[PDB]
Design a protein around this nucleic acid. Structure first.
Lengths: 328, 137, 48, 74, 216, 97, 48, 141, 49, 146
RNA sequence: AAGGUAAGUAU
């Protein structure tokens, strides 16, 4: 009886407020992340329109918001933003708004990324937006790093580079390594390597899927190279000899939910040359003994077999499991 | 039309053939088939009197909490107060001189043509079919 | 609900008259009383 | 060019005009006192008789609602 | 004691004109009458300091039109535009804004400059990477003293003798120090154990955080 | 020991925490990117991921008692996704056939 | 259904067309999915 | 929120629903200051221009216009409702309430899909349209 | 028939001559993650090789 | 003693410890009294009644209030009995089943009024003479244990 | 407690 009375004292307010707001004449009835950006935009626009002498210039109001977009975009795109006709106070407040929104953007992106890494239950749209934010942040950091390298020069001192090069030269001389020559026009394997290279390029399409324009263009290039192997080989050798400039390559980021793996999209025409070069380089480096056995994977031991062989090698060492004299 | 006063004696539900809907019975006022307006006030004042137990002692603590929160995180409008003040030096001609924002990207990026999807060539089925055929020696 | 359940007559009482505050229209009726008891007397009664 | 201008003239205004944008911004600021203003009330409060009769959407109450709307004219 | 070894060496005297800025959302007549009410007028308040805090300009936040990703720099005298009657700083508070223009009175024999980095924004703390453009040999603060005290202080030239620099983000950063050997005139930096001989010219190309100046 | 051909050591295998987290994230991105997707595609992705993990480790699974719980939890998540696709109200005694 | 994989359909139009196989799957296992044992609750019969 | 057209009384909402004969009228009942309403209104503003051909978007303040609170059960913080040729259109969202969308949607593509499906079904004469996405679960994983 | 790590199946594979000139295939398969936007569960092995 | 009574002992101790630990001193207040401001208004009258009579009156009034809540939208295909069980008067259609939904609060109020009805009915049965005083005590104990 | 309302014409 007393237990249910103690329940009753607690449950009375709920029922009272649920009833009194129900049989009365008048009835009464993901926002964290989409909070600061919207409030900041509303506040900046309200301030600008308040100080605007809009008795004559109301039609500029929408235009103002457009600036608040482009500046933000120009910050997100890491491109310069300098409107020539924009008055200095307006530009200053737009810059303040962009700085505040950028601080919130960075903090929100990092917080959401840490949530996802921990295992917080999140939606697909949230994941895509967070991945986009992290891609933008990582690319801004990469631009900073590349600019630092260009401005501050190479970070390897001449002494360190000389030591590394001398060690490599001594190693190559010790092993008696003949350098890999340029692929001859009469190469005995100039066609087998080309077929192997084209097969790897077509492996991305082995699973049946709907083809867009870029994919079918790449497949057409591969088919053209296969139909006329010698013309493709001549183009490949010409690119190897004379091509030092290349078109831009796109970058995306595979989201593993614990980190970001960069993914690079290269032009298919350069992809064929790079694939043939990779196949030829690996075939030559396996013909010769360029890579010593301790470099893995070695095409002969799967990683589990690598672990097995490593454990067996540990166990097979001379008196490895001995500690009589304190050896460890 | 927009910015037009509602005609007098007009029911917004009527004149349009609108029909309501009820997802449940727990939402909305009860359906209806000067001694009342003087009786609602009695219960309202009774509820206010019952709330008067700690109304001053809880609306004062929330005031200090708001002040403490604003000490560290100021309001957004106050974060632009100086800049908003400095807008008084922008003249009307300067206000009119604000340019319209354009888009840099061209037609191929703004409104690209439809990206037709095409089936994978039959040679892929053929090549997948070639694999699995094993030499007898 | 809460007022009458706490004013429940004890096993040693046949009839328990309680003060009632009832709405003038019969809408509601509260048992306008708190079951005050002397704790040694209450414990001895429940021991009996 | 003619058909590009004929469609342009017939185009409507998707967004609000400058006056409507300004009035909506001020009305929003009058309620969100956690962003604007000096004093800070709740999210929806504006700080810091007659009750309109509305149809409940039932065909049985069309006549009474209509007459109450008529009876509210001064 | 009023005059300890720290007061006579590092402490100087500075004057502050604290004017209360009226709330913008007020009528113009109401604004001017509030200004007349003496509630929103300047109040000269003298004070003493151990060091002068120097605010830095905000980062450009954008690439330059010609030289993309150009490091932001500011001349020292632009940073020291503070502490004079001509310039003002709108100090914003969650309650109301204030107009506080400073005016130096007594320059200490050894002046410490603390450059404001590690500013806490609305969401975290960020360092302003702006490069301070200062000379290391000869300056003059006669333009930064009021006319009444300019006669009193016949010396206004300071030489940099010590410089602190912070390398890395505010989350984890190292504190290097460049010290000027008074006897020899050479500059030596020492990061904990490591000691190196940095050229005096290369001192000013660092993100300075704390500096010590000698008036001689 | 290859020389004595005798029992000398003993190797205990276990799935690393990073591999378990990678598998869990793969199952998560299978599940969350499965709104307007056929049940067959979701089950095919789950089967491919599971067979890849199980045929890669093949011994480290049994000792990693946390991996077993992770695998059954992921399988339950996939089956719940399919069941919610079939009907919004969850079943009580859904069959494994 | 296979002919519509390439006919310039909108995103909404294509999204609903990728759920057609499920409509068959539910039909294949209908005698077991649509049961009283597995889905406890009331039953509604189709109008025809 | 402050960019989309606003309707200030019940008669204006009536005329807005009546005026459009070849486009679906999308009306957001709620308050400008409501955070859920701000998210919904910013999504609507994002897709306002793209759906110009087959949709018109208006904003109604229920406190200012309580004219439809009783019939339309406009008591949730945010509500999105579709009309076509003066006829309320229901959507089989899977949420149990087919008469309205009473939550903020993040993705701007999903709202475009919903408007497109509503337009197709209503032009075909239907009064109920099955949404391309089932909202019985937020698909959070 | 299906016993060894390089399955005896591979000795009878039709394209067993072109695969003999395929070197560094495991490293290439591992590095394929930086070119394709889908994670490969069998990143450690090749069915043909 | 068996396992279940021992576990009962540890669980009772757990609840006692949690109450004694998560206890904060009561907050200061201005001592506004209910049932004192009711009789201040001209809406309530004071009398003295047998507790069984008051229980019957409250059961009837709660039934009337729940009945008023049930027929809120003029829907008469949900019937509330005098034992406070809510059942359809007929095989209601699916649209009507949707239209006659109440939240957890309504059913919680219905069940608490059902518990009060059970208690008052036990006391009424005792007062009529159907059950003994010992039987009434055992019935109340069973009611509050189940 | 729900996420289980076919919609459409006609009175």
């Amino acid at each position: 009886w007393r237990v249910w009375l103690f329940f009753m004292r607690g449950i009375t307010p709920l029922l009272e407020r649920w009833l009194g707001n129900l049989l009365a004449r008048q009835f009464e009835g993901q926002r964290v992340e989409s909070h600061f950006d919207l409030e900041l935009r509303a506040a900046v626009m309200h301030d600008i329109l308040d100080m605007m002498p809009e008795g004559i210039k109301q039609n500029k109001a929408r235009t103002i918001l457009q600036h608040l977009s482009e500046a933000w975009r120009c910050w997100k795109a890491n491109i310069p933003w300098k409107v020539p006709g924009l008055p200095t106070p307006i530009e200053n407040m737009i810059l303040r708004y962009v700085k505040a929104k950028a601080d919130w953007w960075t903090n929100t992106a990092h917080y959401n990324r840490e949530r996802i890494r921990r295992g917080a239950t999140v939606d697909k749209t949230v994941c895509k937006k967070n991945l986009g934010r992290l891609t933008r942040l990582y690319l801004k950091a990469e631009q900073e790093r590349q600019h630092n390298y260009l401005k501050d020069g190479p970070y390897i001192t001449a002494e360190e580079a000389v030591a590394v090069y001398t060690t490599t030269v001594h190693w190559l001389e010790s092993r008696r390594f003949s350098p890999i020559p340029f692929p001859p026009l009469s190469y005995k394997h100039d066609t087998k390597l080309l077929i192997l290279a084209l097969e790897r390029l077509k492996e991305a399409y082995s699973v049946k899927s709907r083809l867009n324009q870029s994919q079918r263009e790449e497949l057409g290039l591969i088919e053209q190279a296969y139909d006329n192997p010698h013309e493709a080989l001549s183009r490949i050798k010409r690119h190897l000899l004379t091509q030092r400039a290349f078109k831009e390559v796109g970058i995306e980021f595979m989201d593993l939910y614990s980190h970001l793996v960069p993914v690079y999209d290269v032009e298919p025409l350069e992809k064929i040359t790079d694939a043939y070069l990779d196949q030829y380089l690996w075939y030559e480096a396996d013909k010769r003994r360029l890579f010593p056995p301790w470099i893995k994977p070695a095409d002969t031991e799967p990683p589990p077999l690598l672990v097995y062989k490593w454990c067996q090698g540990i166990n097979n060492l001379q008196d490895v499991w001995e500690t009589s004299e304190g050896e460890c | 039309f927009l910015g037009m006063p509602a005609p007098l004696g007009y029911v917004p539900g009527l004149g349009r053939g609108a029909t309501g809907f009820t997802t449940r019975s727990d939402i909305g006022p009860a359906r209806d088939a000067k001694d009342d307006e003087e009786a609602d006030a009695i219960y309202a004042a009774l509820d206010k009197r019952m709330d008067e137990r700690r109304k001053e002692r809880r609306e004062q603590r929330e005031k200090e909490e708001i002040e403490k929160y604003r000490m560290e995180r100021p309001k957004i409008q106050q974060q632009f107060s100086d800049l908003k003040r400095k807008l008084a030096e922008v003249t009307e001609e300067e206000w009119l001189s604000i340019p319209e924002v354009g888009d840099a990207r061209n037609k191929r990026q703004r409104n690209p043509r439809y990206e037709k999807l095409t089936p994978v060539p039959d040679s892929f089925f053929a090549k997948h079919l070639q694999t699995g055929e094993n030499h007898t020696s | 609900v809460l007022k009458l359940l706490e004013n429940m007559p004890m096993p040693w009482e046949q009839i328990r008259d309680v003060p009632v505050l009832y709405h003038i229209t019969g809408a509601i009726s509260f048992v306008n009383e708190i079951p005050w008891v002397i704790e040694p007397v209450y414990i001895s009664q429940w021991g009996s | 060019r003619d058909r590009s201008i004929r469609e342009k003239q017939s185009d409507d205004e998707v967004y609000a005009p400058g006056l409507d944008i300004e009035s909506s911004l001020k009305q929003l600021a009058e309620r969100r006192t956690d962003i604007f203003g000096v004093e800070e009330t709740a999210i929806g409060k504006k700080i810091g008789p007659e009750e309109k009769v509305t149809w409940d959407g039932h065909s049985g109450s069309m006549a009474r609602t209509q007459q109450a709307a008529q009876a509210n004219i001064t | 004691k009023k005059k300890t070894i720290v007061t006579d060496v590092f402490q100087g005297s500075m004057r502050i004109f604290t004017k209360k800025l009226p709330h913008p959302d007020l009528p113009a007549e109401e604004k001017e009458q509030l200004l007349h009410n003496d509630e929103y007028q300047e109040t000269m308040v003298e004070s003493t300091f151990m060091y002068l805090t120097l605010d830095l300009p905000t980062a450009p936040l954008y690439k330059d039109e010609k030289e993309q990703l150009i490091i932001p720099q500011v001349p020292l005298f632009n940073i020291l535009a503070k502490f004079n009657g001509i310039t003002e700083k709108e100090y914003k508070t969650y309650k109301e804004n204030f107009l506080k223009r400073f005016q130096l009175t007594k320059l200490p024999p050894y002046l410490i400059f603390c450059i404001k980095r590690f500013t806490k924004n609305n969401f975290f703390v960020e360092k302003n990477p702006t490069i301070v453009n200062f000379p290391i040999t000869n300056v003059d603060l006669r333009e930064y003293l009021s006319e009444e005290v300019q006669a009193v202080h016949k010396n206004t030239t300071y030489d940099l003798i010590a410089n602190i620099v912070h390398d890395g983000k505010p989350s984890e950063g190292s504190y290097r120090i460049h010290v000027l050997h008074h006897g020899t005139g050479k500059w030596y930096e020492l990061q904990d154990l490591q000691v190196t001989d940095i050229l005096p010219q290369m001192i000013t190309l660092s993100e300075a955080y704390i500096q010590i100046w000698k008036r001689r | 020991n290859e020389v004595t051909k005798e029992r000398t050591a003993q190797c205990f295998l276990r799935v690393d925490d990073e591999s378990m987290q990678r598998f869990h994230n793969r199952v998560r991105q299978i599940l969350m990117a499965s709104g307007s997707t056929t049940f067959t595609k979701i089950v095919n992705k789950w089967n491919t991921a599971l067979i890849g993990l199980m045929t890669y480790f093949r011994e480290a699974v049994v000792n990693t008692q946390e991996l077993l719980d992770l695998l059954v939890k992921c399988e339950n998540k996939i089956q719940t996704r399919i069941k919610i696709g079939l009907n919004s109200k969850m079943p009580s005694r859904f069959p494994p056939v | 259904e296979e002919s519509m994989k390439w006919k310039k359909l909108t995103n909404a139009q294509r999204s609903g067309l990728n759920q057609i196989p499920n409509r068959r799957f539910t039909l294949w296992w209908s005698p077991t999915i649509n049961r009283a044992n597995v889905y406890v609750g009331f039953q509604v019969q189709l109008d025809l | 929120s402050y960019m989309l057209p606003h309707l200030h009384n019940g008669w204006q909402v009536d005329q807005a629903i009546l005026s459009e004969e070849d486009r679906v009228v999308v009306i957001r009942f709620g308050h400008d200051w409501d955070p859920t309403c701000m998210k919904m209104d910013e999504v609507l503003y994002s897709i306002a221009e793209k759906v110009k051909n087959f949709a018109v978007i208006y904003l109604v303040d229920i406190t200012e216009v309580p004219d439809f609170n009783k019939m339309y059960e406009l008591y949730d913080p945010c509500t999105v409702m579709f009309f076509f040729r003066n006829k309320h259109i229901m959507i089989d969202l899977g949420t149990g309430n087919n008469n309205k969308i009473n939550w903020a949607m993040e993705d701007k593509q999903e709202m475009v899909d919903i408007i497109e499906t509503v337009y197709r079904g209503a032009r075909k004469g239907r009064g109920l349209v099955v949404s391309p996405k089932d909202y019985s679960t937020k698909y959070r994983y | 028939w299906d016993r060894g790590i390089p399955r005896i199946n591979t000795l009878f594979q039709k394209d067993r001559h072109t695969l003999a000139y395929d070197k560094g295939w495991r490293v290439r398969t591992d590095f394929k993650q930086y070119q394709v936007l889908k994670q490969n569960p069998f990143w450690w092995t090749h069915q043909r090789h | 003693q068996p396992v279940k009574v021992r576990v009962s002992y540890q669980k009772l101790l757990k609840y006692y410890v949690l109450n004694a630990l998560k206890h904060r001193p009561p907050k200061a207040q201005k001592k506004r009294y209910l049932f004192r401001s009711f009789k201040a208004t001209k809406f309530f009258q004071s009398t003295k009644l047998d507790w069984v009579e008051v229980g019957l009156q409250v059961c009837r009034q709660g039934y009337n209030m729940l009945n008023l809540l049930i027929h809120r939208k003029n829907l008469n295909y949900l019937h509330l009995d005098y034992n406070f069980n809510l059942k359809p008067v007929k095989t209601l259609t699916t649209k009507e089943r949707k239209k006659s939904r109440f939240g957890n609060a309504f059913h919680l109020c219905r069940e608490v009024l059902r518990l009060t009805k059970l208690v008052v009915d036990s006391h009424v049965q005792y007062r009529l003479g159907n059950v003994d005083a010992f039987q009434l005590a055992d019935g109340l104990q069973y009611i509050f244990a189940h």
